[PDB]
């Protein structure tokens, strides 16, 4: 038989070793679009080891993930159940649903605005992507595909796929804090709708694990190089609605991220400005406030 | 033909009548498949070029700093097998020495034999260190894929089991392709690699602790060409030390079995000498007429045992022997 | 009481960011600082923990972050493979393989001993 | 008060006493570390590593010796 | 710290050495927390003082 059908049978059997040994061998004439469609089937079925096989053998995830492909990843039902339908129904009700609603990328963007909260305004809801959606339904590709795929896996309860998509790519700690906030907010929306304990407890467990990944990445980054760790916690995340990792974690109410020596040292450095007379302070600050000559007897940090 | 290519596929001077043309294919290889994607630059270099210009390439045009060690990976050309724990301790000691000294590893490059064990070492590493390969242009599979000036060409891990051509290992960091004009014949890379190692070892290091930039050449198995190149290594001025690894067979096991029972080089008893000769003639299936010639070449090697360093496994990585021979061959 | 310190170090971010956002002058005198902001904005328009990074330095941050993920996963793998549970598991697996293998060697030794006795009978 | 002014000769014996109790304390923590369950699991794992590679080697050697004995019996 | 432990094993009057090391590490912890250095420094110094103690 043809190798796409062999790999389809391998997806059916959930045996990555069989495909590893026989199907992906030298000389196998893969047709045009076989691996992209197989990757689509592997993602919608939540077969993460087959996604690992297809990214190891070469699928070029940047070329694979388009507008229509991510949309088809959002409307699939050939996998684990999700709370996406309730969330999209709620945001379309609040912004203003047929059972055959082909949920758009714009609507999922509204879901990320609703769950993230505050002032998070997703790139989906931005005007440029709206004119791209209004004129098409490397322009239709995505510059940072692993970001959108991790938002996909977090939003549709697929956890092992979310860990795998967390590992590959960049801006991963911001990805982990966004995933923590989305899992906590979906847990809170499920418990406000007071459903089964399984969905709320599992989404809370998901947010705790992803935040623990963020903390352990913080610890490793602090052990390697402190200055680049400060740079990591403060740079403008262009892909995560123009914020920093501190803002995303404080949005996530995430206690032991801002408990760590890196974040506290950064906040302490921000707290006192360009002033180095910063040992047993408070009383010196009050004495400098009450006495305008008292500033000149204080040490100041250079530029 | 004599060059081994097809009769209609055309377009040293002895019987091949080559014409000296400028170089045309050089750039960067994008390694798709085989796990992680790795970018590895490649330059086709003629086998009779001056080594100082390749040195200028590797210093200025490649942004590679001058290392403190050259761990050569000479070994058997054909594909063999080893113990799993022996390959694991070999790979761990190799990558440990490579990160401690910042070494350049002159692995052969084509994915057959001890080069595949070097690729197994870099899979254990999996995260700088240079791994410059010296492989012939005529033997690499998909020669038309690597044609292009400054173009990032795709290179799959396609390896036909019946093809004579051998695909390169996908996790070397760099590549040098020795082009003598022929296809499918070895020997195009040996002399260029020797003159490159000599010209690197004549360069004075920044620390200048020993004698310039030191070289430690490692041998795993090998044929009579392994014995010939160890003879070239020891008689070299400067005398580059040789690390051998037994427990594998072929020439390395014979060298270690001699080195355990040689004393002052030629102080070998008659029964051990006859046992070594009969294992050369039968266990390695060599000719008995050239067995005495290989024995006296081994004795010419054996006159300088102060630099031959062995490694016996039985924790205790090969980097112990690598650093010990590094301190021996430094003066 | 179990969470006290973490609550304090959380609320520090809120109050540091708030008092960074506030003007230079106190609330009884804040009209002066308000008029200086209006003066600055209307001469620059009508006429703190966000380090804006350039692309190359950002690329060094990405490479640093990737090697942190690699060190994290190799440290987790080493810690899982050095815990007592996995060690006892793998030791049990090899001891079962050893017991089968030693039984096979024992039977082959029986065959070799019988062959040696027959060879001594034949010599 | 409690400060006992000690002569040098007594001080030598106190110093040597302190040397012995330091040596006993270090060898005693060495015995505790080499009798704790964690290090015992570790050494048992490594010994099973080395011996399992040894036993696989012994199996290959066994097959070779059995074949050699059979060939010698055939050529006799 | 490991250099201090090696220097503890090799030498005499080691109980006095350990107690002075305890007081010095605790005092350096308090002095570093007085200047508000990084909490890893102070907590490491308290851990060292507890070790020598």
B283 Cβ neighbours under 8 A, 6+ residues apart: none
Across B286-317, b (16+ Cβ under 10 Å) vs e yields: beeeebeebbebbebbbebeebbbbbebeeeb
The answer to whether the CB of B225 falls within 8 A of the CB of B80 is no
Token pair, residue A147, equals: 């970001």
d(CA A210, CA A218): 12
Question: Tell me, what DSSP letter sits at residue B290?
Answer: T
> Strands B104-106 and B242-245, how do they pair?
unpaired
Question: Within a 10 A sphere around the Cβ of B142, how many other Cβ atoms?
Answer: 16
Chain A interface includes B316 (CB < 8 A): no
Chains E and C physically touch (3 or more Cβ atom pairs below 8 Å): no
The answer to whether the CB of B139 falls within 8 A of the CB of B166 is yes
Identify the closest residue of chain A to B37 by CA–CA distance. A56
Token pair, residue B78, equals: 């054909």
A127 Cβ neighbours under 8 A, 6+ residues apart: none
Question: Which chain B residues have a beta carbon less than 8 Å from that of D57?
Answer: 83
Chain D interface includes B83 (CB < 8 A): yes
Question: Which chain C residues have a beta carbon less than 8 Å from that of B127?
Answer: 67, 70-71, 74
**Contact map slice: D 9-38 vs C, CB within 8 A:** 37-38
Token pair, residue C15, equals: 């109050």
Residue from E48, E4, E52 nearest E30 by CA: E48
E45-52, long-range: CB < 8 A, 24+ apart: E48/E1, E48/E4, E48/E21, E49/E21, E49/E22, E49/E23, E49/E24, E49/E25, E51/E1, E52/E4, E52/E8, E52/E18, E52/E19, E52/E21, E52/E22, E52/E25
d(CA B79, CA B135): 16
The shortest C-alpha distance from E33 to chain D (Å) reads 33
List phi, psi (to 5°) of B147. Answer: -85, 130
For chain C, which residues lie within 8 Å of any Cβ of chain A, measuring from their own Cβ?
3, 5-7, 9-10, 12-14, 16, 20, 48-53, 57-58, 60-62, 64-69, 71-73, 75
C-alpha distance from residue A66 to each of A61, A122, A149, A175 (Å): 10, 17, 11, 20
Least CB-CB distance to C6: which of A221, A234, A256? A256
Q: If you search the block for the tokens 């008659």, which residue do you land on?
A: B270
Residue from B153, B190, B212 nearest B29 by CA: B153
Helical H segments across B143-269, by residue range: 190-201, 224-234, 250-260
Most A CBs within 10 Å: which of B29, B30, B31, B32, as the mutation test of the A interface?
B32
Token pair, residue B89, equals: 């301790």
Chain D interface includes B85 (CB < 8 A): yes
Identify the closest residue of chain B to D57 by CA–CA distance. B83
Question: Which chain E residues have a beta carbon less than 8 Å from that of D19?
Answer: 12
The shortest C-alpha distance from B327 to chain C (Å) reads 31
d(CA B53, CA B61): 11
List phi, psi (to 5°) of B67. Answer: -80, 180
Residue from A65, A40, A64, A60 nearest A50 by CA: A40
The answer to whether the CB of A80 falls within 8 A of the CB of A157 is yes
How remote is the C-alpha of B39 from its chain's centroid? Answer: 21
C111 Cβ neighbours under 8 A, 6+ residues apart: D66
Chain A interface includes E9 (CB < 8 A): no
Terminal Cα-to-Cα distance of chain B (whole angstroms): 49
What count of residues does chain C have? 123
For residue B217, list its beta bridge partners.
B72, B242
Token pair, residue A143, equals: 């510059």
d(CA B149, CA B25): 6
The shortest C-alpha distance from A259 to chain E (Å) reads 11
C-alpha distance from residue A68 to each of A47, A63, A142, C44 (Å): 21, 12, 11, 45
Residue from A249, A276, A248, A272 nearest A260 by CA: A249
Least CB-CB distance to A58: which of B32, B159, B160? B32
B140 Cβ neighbours under 8 A, 6+ residues apart: B110, B146, B165, B166, B167, B168, B177
d(CA A107, CA A87): 10
- Kindly list the partner chains of chain E, i.e. chains with 3 or more CB atom pairs below 8 Å: A, D
Identify the closest residue of chain D to C110 by CA–CA distance. D66
CB contact under 8 A, B83 and D53: yes
For residue B40, list its beta bridge partners.
B29
Question: Which chain D residues have a beta carbon less than 8 Å from that of B314?
Answer: 50
d(CA B176, CA E22): 60
List phi, psi (to 5°) of B4. Answer: 85, -5
For chain C, which residues lie within 8 Å of any Cβ of chain B, measuring from their own Cβ?
67, 70-71, 74
The shortest C-alpha distance from E35 to chain D (Å) reads 37
Directed axis angle between helix E39-52 and helix E14-34, to 10°?
160
Cis peptide before A36 (omega within 30 of 0): no
C-alpha distance from residue B47 to each of B136, B181, B192 (Å): 9, 9, 6
Chains A and D physically touch (3 or more Cβ atom pairs below 8 Å): no
The shortest C-alpha distance from A61 to chain B (Å) reads 12
Residue from A94, A108, A118, A190 nearest A148 by CA: A108
CB contact under 8 A, C12 and A258: yes
Phi-psi region of A98 (alpha: psi -120 to 50; beta: other; left: phi over 0): beta
Question: Tell me, what DSSP letter sits at residue B189?
Answer: S
The shortest C-alpha distance from E31 to chain A (Å) reads 10
What is the tally of helices (H) and strands (E) in chain A? 17, 0
Chain C interface includes B85 (CB < 8 A): no
Q: After which residues is chain D broken (C to N over 2.5 A)?
A: none
**Contact map slice: A 52-111 vs B, CB within 8 A:** 56-58
How remote is the C-alpha of C60 from its chain's centroid? Answer: 19
Q: State whether residue D9 is helix, strand or coil.
A: helix
Helical H segments across A57-96, by residue range: 61-64, 67-74, 84-95
Q: State whether residue C64 is helix, strand or coil.
A: helix
d(CA A15, CA B193): 45
C98 Cβ neighbours under 8 A, 6+ residues apart: D48, D51, D52, D55
Question: Tell me, what DSSP letter sits at residue B28?
Answer: E
d(CA A237, CA A243): 6
CB contact under 8 A, E14 and D26: no
d(CA B70, CA B320): 16
d(CA A265, CA A268): 5
Burial label, B164 (beta-carbon count in 10 A; 0-12, 13-18, 19+) = exposed
Question: Tell me, what DSSP letter sits at residue C27?
Answer: G
Q: State whether residue A298 is helix, strand or coil.
A: coil
Question: Which chain B residues have a beta carbon less than 8 Å from that of C71?
Answer: 127
Token pair, residue E21, equals: 């090391």
List phi, psi (to 5°) of B43. Answer: -135, 125
Identify the closest residue of chain D to B313 by CA–CA distance. D50
How remote is the C-alpha of A173 from its chain's centroid? Answer: 9
CA neighbours closer than 13 Å in the CB half-sphere of residue A209: 13
Question: Which chain E residues have a beta carbon less than 8 Å from that of D18?
Answer: 12-15
The shortest C-alpha distance from D3 to chain C (Å) reads 45
Residue from A253, A240, A246 nearest A120 by CA: A240
- Kindly list the partner chains of chain B, i.e. chains with 3 or more CB atom pairs below 8 Å: A, C, D
Residue from A32, A14, A35 nearest A24 by CA: A35
d(CA A217, CA A225): 12
Token pair, residue A15, equals: 């045996």
CA angle at A191 for the pair A185 and A195, rounded to the nearest 5°: 130
The shortest C-alpha distance from D26 to chain E (Å) reads 9
B33-38, long-range: CB < 8 A, 24+ apart: B33/A56, B33/A57, B33/A58, B33/B156, B33/B157, B33/B170, B34/A56, B34/B157, B34/B170, B34/B171, B35/A56, B35/B123, B35/B170, B36/A56, B36/B126, B36/B171, B37/A58, B38/B170, B38/B171, B38/B173
d(CA E1, CA E7): 10
A124 Cβ neighbours under 8 A, 6+ residues apart: A105, A106, A108, A109, A112
Resolution at which this structure was determined, Å: 3.4
Q: State whether residue A250 is helix, strand or coil.
A: helix
What count of residues does chain D have? 76
Most E CBs within 10 Å: which of D22, D26, D27, as the mutation test of the E interface?
D22
Host H or E run for residue B216: strand B216-220
For residue B44, list its beta bridge partners.
B177
Token pair, residue B313, equals: 């496994």
Identify the closest residue of chain D to C104 by CA–CA distance. D59
Query: What is the DSSP secondary-structure string of B40-89?
Result: EEEEEEETT--HHHHHHIIIIIS-----S-EEE--B-SS-----HHHHHH
d(CA B112, CA B159): 11
Question: Within a 10 A sphere around the Cβ of C110, how many other Cβ atoms?
Answer: 10
Question: Which chain B residues have a beta carbon less than 8 Å from that of D50?
Answer: 314
Helical H segments across chain B, by residue range: 51-56, 84-101, 114-125, 190-201, 224-234, 250-260, 270-278, 291-302, 319-328
> Strands B149-155 and B242-245, how do they pair?
unpaired
Chain D to chain E Cβ contacts (< 8 Å): 10
Identify the closest residue of chain A to B33 by CA–CA distance. A57
Host H or E run for residue B220: strand B216-220
Residue from C17, C13, C4, C7 nearest A255 by CA: C7
B80 Cβ neighbours under 8 A, 6+ residues apart: B113, B114, B221, B248, B249, B250
Least CB-CB distance to A58: which of B33, B160, B161? B33
Q: If you search the block for the tokens 């050369």, which residue do you land on?
A: B280
Token pair, residue A13, equals: 């059997």
CB contact under 8 A, A56 and B35: yes
Task: Name the maximum alpha-carbon separation found in chain C.
Answer: 119
The answer to whether the CB of A48 falls within 8 A of the CB of A164 is yes
CB contact under 8 A, E14 and D22: yes
d(CA A161, CA A150): 8
- Kindly list the partner chains of chain D, i.e. chains with 3 or more CB atom pairs below 8 Å: B, C, E
C-alpha distance from residue B119 to each of A142, B111, B168, C45 (Å): 34, 8, 10, 62
Experimental method, per PDB record = cryo-EM
> Strands B149-155 and B38-46, how do they pair?
unpaired
d(CA A274, CA A238): 28
Burial label, A72 (beta-carbon count in 10 A; 0-12, 13-18, 19+) = middle
Question: Which chain B residues have a beta carbon less than 8 Å from that of C74?
Answer: 127
CB contact under 8 A, A278 and E36: yes
- Kindly list the partner chains of chain A, i.e. chains with 3 or more CB atom pairs below 8 Å: B, C, E
Burial label, C49 (beta-carbon count in 10 A; 0-12, 13-18, 19+) = middle
The answer to whether the CB of B40 falls within 8 A of the CB of B154 is no
Question: Tell me, what DSSP letter sits at residue B169?
Answer: P
Residue from E40, D6, B315 nearest A262 by CA: E40
How remote is the C-alpha of B171 from its chain's centroid? Answer: 16
Token pair, residue A243, equals: 């914020």
Chain C interface includes A232 (CB < 8 A): yes
The three-state DSSP-derived secondary structure of C88-107 is: HHHHHHHHHHHHHHHHHHHH
What is the signed CA dihedral for B169, B175, B176, B180, rounded to 10 degrees? 30
What is the tally of helices (H) and strands (E) in chain B? 9, 10
The answer to whether the CB of E45 falls within 8 A of the CB of E29 is yes
CB contact under 8 A, E9 and D26: yes
List phi, psi (to 5°) of A75. Answer: -95, 5
How remote is the C-alpha of C51 from its chain's centroid? Answer: 24
d(CA A273, CA A151): 37
Host H or E run for residue B39: strand B38-46
A61 Cβ neighbours under 8 A, 6+ residues apart: A55, A145, A146, A149
Q: State whether residue B108 is helix, strand or coil.
A: coil
Token pair, residue A53, equals: 């096989």
The shortest C-alpha distance from C86 to chain D (Å) reads 10
For residue B75, list its beta bridge partners.
B220
Burial label, B137 (beta-carbon count in 10 A; 0-12, 13-18, 19+) = buried
Question: Within a 10 A sphere around the Cβ of A298, how many other Cβ atoms?
Answer: 15
D19 Cβ neighbours under 8 A, 6+ residues apart: E12
């Amino acid at each position: 038989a043809s190798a796409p059908d062999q790999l389809s049978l391998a997806l059916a059997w959930n045996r990555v070793d069989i495909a590893r040994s026989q199907i992906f061998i030298y000389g196998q004439q893969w047709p045009v679009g076989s691996l992209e469609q197989a990757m689509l089937d592997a993602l919608v079925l939540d077969r993460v080891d087959f996604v690992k096989l297809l990214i190891e053998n070469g699928v070029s995830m940047h070329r694979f993930l388009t507008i229509s492909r991510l949309e088809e990843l959002y409307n699939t039902r050939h996998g684990p159940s999700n709370t996406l339908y309730h969330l999209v129904r709620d945001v379309k009700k609040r912004e203003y649903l047929p059972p055959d609603y082909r949920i758009s990328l714009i609507d999922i963007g509204l879901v990320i605005e609703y769950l993230m909260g505050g002032a998070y305004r997703c790139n989906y809801t931005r005007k440029r992507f709206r004119t791209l959606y209004h004129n098409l339904f490397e322009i239709n590709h995505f510059p940072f595909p692993f970001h959108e795929l991790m938002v996909w896996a977090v939003l549709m309860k697929r956890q092992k796929m979310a860990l795998f998509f967390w590992q590959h790519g960049e801006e991963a700690m911001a990805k982990a804090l966004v995933a923590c906030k989305l899992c906590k907010a979906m847990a809170h929306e499920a418990s406000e709708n007071d459903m089964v304990d399984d969905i709320s407890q599992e989404l809370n467990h998901n947010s705790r694990d992803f935040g623990q990944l963020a903390v352990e990445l913080l610890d490793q980054s602090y052990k390697q190089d402190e200055q680049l760790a400060m740079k990591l916690l403060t740079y403008e995340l262009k892909n995560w609605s123009n914020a920093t990792c501190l803002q995303l974690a404080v949005a996530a109410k995430h206690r032991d991220f801002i408990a760590h020596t890196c974040s506290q040292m950064l906040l302490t450095d921000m707290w006192m400005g360009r002033l180095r007379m910063r040992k047993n302070s408070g009383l010196k600050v009050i004495l400098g406030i009450l006495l305008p000559p008292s500033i000149l007897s204080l040490e100041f940090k250079n530029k | 033909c004599c060059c081994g290519r097809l009769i209609g596929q055309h377009v040293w001077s002895i019987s091949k009548h080559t014409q000296l043309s400028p170089t045309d294919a050089f750039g960067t290889i994008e390694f798709q498949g085989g796990g992680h994607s790795n970018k590895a630059m490649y330059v086709r270099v003629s086998f009779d070029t001056k080594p100082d210009l390749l040195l200028h390439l590797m210093t200025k045009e490649w942004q590679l700093e001058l290392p403190k060690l050259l761990i050569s990976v000479h070994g058997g050309l054909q594909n063999f097998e080893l113990q799993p724990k022996l390959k694991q301790v070999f790979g761990k000691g190799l990558i440990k020495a490579a990160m401690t000294t910042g070494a350049w590893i002159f692995t052969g490059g084509v994915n057959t034999g001890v080069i595949r064990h070097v690729g197994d070492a870099l899979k254990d590493h999996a995260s700088k260190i240079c791994t410059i390969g010296i492989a012939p242009w005529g033997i690499v599979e998909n020669q038309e894929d690597l044609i292009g000036r400054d173009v990032v060409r795709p290179y799959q891990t396609m390896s036909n089991p019946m093809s004579k051509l051998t695909v390169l290992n996908s996790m070397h960091s760099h590549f040098i392709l020795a082009d003598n004009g022929t296809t499918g014949k070895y020997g195009a890379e040996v002399k260029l690699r020797r003159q490159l190692e000599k010209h690197i070892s004549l360069q004075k290091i920044n620390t200048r602790i020993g004698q310039g930039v030191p070289v430690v050449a490692l041998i795993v198995e090998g044929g009579p060409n392994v014995i010939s190149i160890v003879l070239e290594y020891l008689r070299d001025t400067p005398p580059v030390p040789v690390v051998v690894c037994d427990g594998s067979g072929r020439a390395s096991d014979i060298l270690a079995f001699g080195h355990k029972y040689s004393e002052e080089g030629g102080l070998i008893n008659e029964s051990l000498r006859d046992q070594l000769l009969v294992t050369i003639q039968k266990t390695f299936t060599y000719t008995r007429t050239q067995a005495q010639h290989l024995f006296i070449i081994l004795m010419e090697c054996m006159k300088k045992k102060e630099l031959i360093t062995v490694f016996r496994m039985g924790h205790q990585d090969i980097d112990l022997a690598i650093l010990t021979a590094l301190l021996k061959g430094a003066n | 009481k179990s969470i006290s310190n973490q609550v304090w170090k959380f609320q520090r971010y809120q109050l540091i960011m708030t008092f960074h956002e506030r003007p230079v002058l106190p609330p009884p005198l804040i009209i002066f600082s308000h008029m200086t902001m209006i003066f600055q904005h209307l001469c620059c328009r009508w006429r703190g923990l966000k380090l804006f990074i350039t692309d190359d330095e950002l690329k060094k941050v990405h490479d640093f972050e990737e090697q942190c993920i690699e060190e994290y996963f190799r440290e987790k793998d080493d810690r899982f493979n050095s815990s007592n549970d996995e060690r006892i598991r793998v030791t049990s697996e090899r001891v079962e393989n050893m017991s089968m293998r030693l039984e096979e060697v024992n039977e082959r030794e029986h065959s070799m001993k019988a062959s040696l006795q027959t060879v001594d009978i034949r010599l």
